């Protein structure tokens, strides 16, 4: 039933409030998602001025309900099954040899619009590290979100690694641990193990003077034959 809500192009709103080593900030995003093609087009603006962390470190935090699930895998799509009432998405993101983010979001429909409301707290970052030092490249992120059922919370868990390229040529690893739980009390689809293959392309609006990120993203479920 939730899947019916995603057969066409759906407007998306994202709202994030963050605090990283005491640097407070907000981001607003708008765009649209077309789950038929696993396609997301989003533009984010830092509404508080300069973003105190690198945009690439926020991509994963800033709507996996827009994944393209192959027809033969549609029984494994937790995210859509939770809609319209939605789900809580929680993560801990451990930046190797640096701080961590803890995030909590509610993802649900408000009318025809899919809304992602997030709070992010980051702690234990190094002032001259790759995050607070803004040493990460701004280009592309691509990896696999490994999903497994969480029957006790009627939800899912996921784990994955993001290998952020550093401007000197190195890598800043960000190990993600994720849990999603439905907001409503109705049945949800609890999946067999699988993954989401996700590719995120980051760019700039040449006419935009505020601190911002343009995102073109594709998300495809895979791993079941």
UniProtKB/Swiss-Prot annotation:
Changing residue 74 to R: In Topaz; shifts the major emission and exitation peak up to 20 nm. Changing residue 63 to L: In EYFP; leads to yellow fluorescence, folds faster and more efficiently at 37 degrees Celsius and has superior solubility and brightness. Changing residue 198 to Y: Gives rise to yellow-emission variants. In EYFP; leads to yellow fluorescence, folds faster and more efficiently at 37 degrees Celsius and has superior solubility and brightness. Contains a chromophore consisting of modified amino acid residues. Maturation of the chromophore requires nothing other than molecular oxygen. The keyword Nucleotidyltransferase does not apply. Changing residue 100 to T: In EBFP1.2; shifts the excitation and emission spectra to shorter wavelengths and increases quantum yields compared to BFP. Changing residue 162 to V: In P9; increases fluorescence at 475 nm excitation. In R10-3; matures to the red-emitting state with excitation and emission maxima at 555 and 585 nm, respectively. InterPro entries: GFP, GFP-related, Green_fluorescent_prot. This is Green fluorescent protein. The gene is GFP.
